[PDB]
Amino acid sequence: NRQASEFIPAQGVDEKTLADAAQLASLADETPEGRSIVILAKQRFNLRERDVQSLHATFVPFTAQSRMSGINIDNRMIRKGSVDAIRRHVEANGGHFPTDVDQKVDQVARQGATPLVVVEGSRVLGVIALKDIVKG
Numbered sequence: 682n683r684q685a686s687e688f689i690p691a692q693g694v695d696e697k698t699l700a701d702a703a704q705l706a707s708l709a710d711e712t713p714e715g716r717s718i719v720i721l722a723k724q725r726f727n728l729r730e731r732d733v734q735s736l737h738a739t740f741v742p743f744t745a746q747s748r749m750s751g752i753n754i755d756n757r758m759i760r761k762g763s764v765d766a767i768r769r770h771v772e773a774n775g776g777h778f779p780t781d782v783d784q785k786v787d788q789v790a791r792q793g794a795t796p797l798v799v800v801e802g803s804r805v806l807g808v809i810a811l812k813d814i815v816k817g
Contacts, residue, residue, distance in 0.1 A: 682713065682723050682752075682812060682813070682814060682816070683713065683714050683717065683785060683795055683811045683812065683813055683814075684713075684714060684720075684721070684811060684812070685703075685714065685717045685718040685720070685721030685723045685797075685809050685811045685812075686721070686794065686810060686811060686812035687708070687721075687810055687812075688703055688721065688723065688725075688753065688799075688807050688808060688810060689741070689782055689785045689807055689808055689810070690782070690806065690807035691698035691778060691779040691782040691798075691804065691805035691806055691807045691808070692782065692798075693755040693779070693793040693804065694758035694783060694801070694805075694806040694807055696726060696803045696807060697748060698728050698801075698806055698807075699799060699806045699807025699808075700725065700726045700727055700729075700804070700807075701722060701727060701729055701760075702720035702757070702759040702799050702800075702801045702807075703718055703719075703721065703722050703761060703797075703799045703806075703807070703809050704718070704719045704722045704723075704730065704731060704732045705732070705751075705754075705757070705759055706727065706741050706750065706752055706759045706760050706761035706799050707719050707740075707742035707750070707751040707761055707799075707809075708730075708731045708733065708752055709741060709742045709743070709750055709752065710742075710743045710750045710761070711742065711743060712743060714795070714797070714811050715750070717745070717811060718761070718809050718811070719735050721782070721809065722738045727817065731752070732754075733752065733754065736755060736756070737752065737754075737755075737796060738752055738754030738755070739752065739753050739754070739792070741753065741760070746807075747762060747766050747770075748762060748763045748766045749761065749762020749766035749767060750762065750764060751772070751799075751800075757801060758801065758802060759786075759799060759800060759801045759806070760799065760800055761797050761798070761799040761809065762797065762798065763795075763797065763798075764783065764786045764796050764797075764798045764808070767774040767796065767797075767799070767800055767805065768783070770800065771800055771801030771804060773802030773803060774800075774802075775803055776800070776802065776803025776804045776806060777803075777805065778797045778798060778800070778805040779805060781800075782798075782805060782807060783805075783808075785808055786810070789808065789810035789811075793812070793813055794810045794811055794812045794813070795810070795811040796808045796809070796810050796811075797810075797811065
């Protein structure tokens with residue numbers, strides 16, 4: 682039972698930009714968080730959705746083998762995965778992730794939150810830090 686609580690941009694991308702790509706990479710996620718993230722973008726910075734049906738883009742459902750999921754379209758390629766999965770994906774692209782944000786991902790882990798990293802092209806556009814909620 683975890684939901685996105687806040688996300689920080691990787692260096693070179695605005696947080697709202699991170700939230701929009703955070704959404705398209707999270708459209709096809711079947712994880713409970715997959716809905717929390719797409720709502721995290723709308724409530725915090727931009728009530729917005731995906732543009733796959735207008736652009737004819739492809740969703741990539743989350744797989745446990747890579748522990749990540751994302752979306753690809755003509756003009757954009759973005760993914761969202763565990764920092765370990767996405768970070769391996771950026772270096773495999775030949776790209777790099779921002780250390781200040783990879784550290785912020787580390788801080789989300791130590792507070793008990795789950796840092797998902799979302800990338801666009803071969804770099805990270807930001808991390809989505811998800812937090813746990815309390816219920817009786």
